[PDB]
Design a binder for this molecule. Structure first.
Ligand SMILES: [Br-]
Ligand SMILES: [Br-]
Ligand SMILES: [Br-]
Ligand SMILES: [Br-]
Length: 129
């Protein structure tokens, strides 16, 4: 499913992400826009053989099991296919784990390079939250 901006904002807010670990909703929506373009089914393979999955592009090396990334941990105890779902619950639950891991949202390359230090409020502008 390809979410609308405001639609994803509301689903994320409903899932407890607004100000989670201090990150405003604007950050989460900006991250998703640049990681998957709001597409739950996005997947991208990395040079190390790991694959990123879903709306927030969660990596198979540490967070989920895809049956093909040797030596991987499944810190979120979930198959990576669960992350491609129209219901964002699994992606949100795993993300909360990632962001509490130490580096915060710098764990997402697109966030660091394209969202960090920008007016993220613009991402939630005009939405009925
Ligand atoms: Br947009
Ligand atoms: Br915001
Ligand atoms: Br949802
Ligand atoms: Br932090």
């Amino acid at each position: 499913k390809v979410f609308g901006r405001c639609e994803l904002a509301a689903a994320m807010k409903r899932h407890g992400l607004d100000n989670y670990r201090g990150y405003s909703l604007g950050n989460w929506v900006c991250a998703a826009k640049f990681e998957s373009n709001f597409n739950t089914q996005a997947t991208n393979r990395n040079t190390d053989g790991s694959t990123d999955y879903g709306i927030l592009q969660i990596n198979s090396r540490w967070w989920c099991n895809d049956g093909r990334t040797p030596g991987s941990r499944n810190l979120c105890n979930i198959p990576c296919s669960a992350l491609l779902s129209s219901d964002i619950t699994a992606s949100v639950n795993c993300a909360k784990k990632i962001v509490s891991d130490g580096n915060g949202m710098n764990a997402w390359v697109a966030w660091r390079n394209r969202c960090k230090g920008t007016d993220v409020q613009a991402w939630i502008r005009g939405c009925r939250l």
